[PDB]
Amino acid sequence: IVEGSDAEIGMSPWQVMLFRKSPQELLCGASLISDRWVLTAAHCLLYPPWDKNFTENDLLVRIGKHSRTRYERNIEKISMLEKIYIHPRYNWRENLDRDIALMKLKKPVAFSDYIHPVCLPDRETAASLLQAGYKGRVTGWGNLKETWTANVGKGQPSVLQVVNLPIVERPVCKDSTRIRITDNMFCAGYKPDEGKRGDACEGDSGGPFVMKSPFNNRWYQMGIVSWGEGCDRDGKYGFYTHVFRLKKWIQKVIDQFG
């Protein structure tokens, strides 16, 4: 997360860490949507152009975390994956259309003050909350900034980072990139002359872009950090996998499996 700040403890109890077991590596973010299911981006699990294709045994999930640098035994929960489900029409070769995947835990995880599921929006929530100017929140342990060389590497925080960002109007999202955008994504971020800055970044993929509903004051996951060109670049915006748009697939998966 770029230009965000340290999260308050338990401020994002649905936050999940997708972790490569060996060689150890924090791969991406993810979100808890029930005691057995975790939502993340497809490209974190499968992305041929980078020789990425992780199977269940290569990974684990770390839930309830605050600091990345140590195992937090009183709040943290580690889960083995029983099965990964990438969206069958996940378009990796072109524009990450439908960048979404589900991971079923082998066992249900117990909830606590630090582990709690986020809500998925229904048609109207999507319709009423996804408006230009409305702000959502993005969290993660990804990089703090775009670096001058890909090799510079990773500048990661120790504590979960949070940043609030405004949804931008589709014509602007479209004109901002040459990548073909689709109705299954939306973009968020401040415009060049809005002053404020902030964006998600490498390592944030799969994390939730949540919104608090003014009607029932529950938190809804409207997006999934998916892609962007650089991080926090002017006239550039982060892109998120539109969750309501892919909700029928999510429900079919959950109702058919586990």
Binding site: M11, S112, C119, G133, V162, N164, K212
Partner: peptide
């Protein structure tokens, strides 16, 4: 357990707000 989804044990359930939550509400 999506019945209780989206309600944070350390915030909503304790009637406590977080430091930037208000910024979102005002955006509406």
């Amino acid at each position: 357990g999506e019945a209780d989804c989206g309600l944070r044990p350390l915030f909503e359930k304790k009637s406590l707000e977080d430091k930037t939550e208000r910024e979102l509400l005002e955006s509406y």
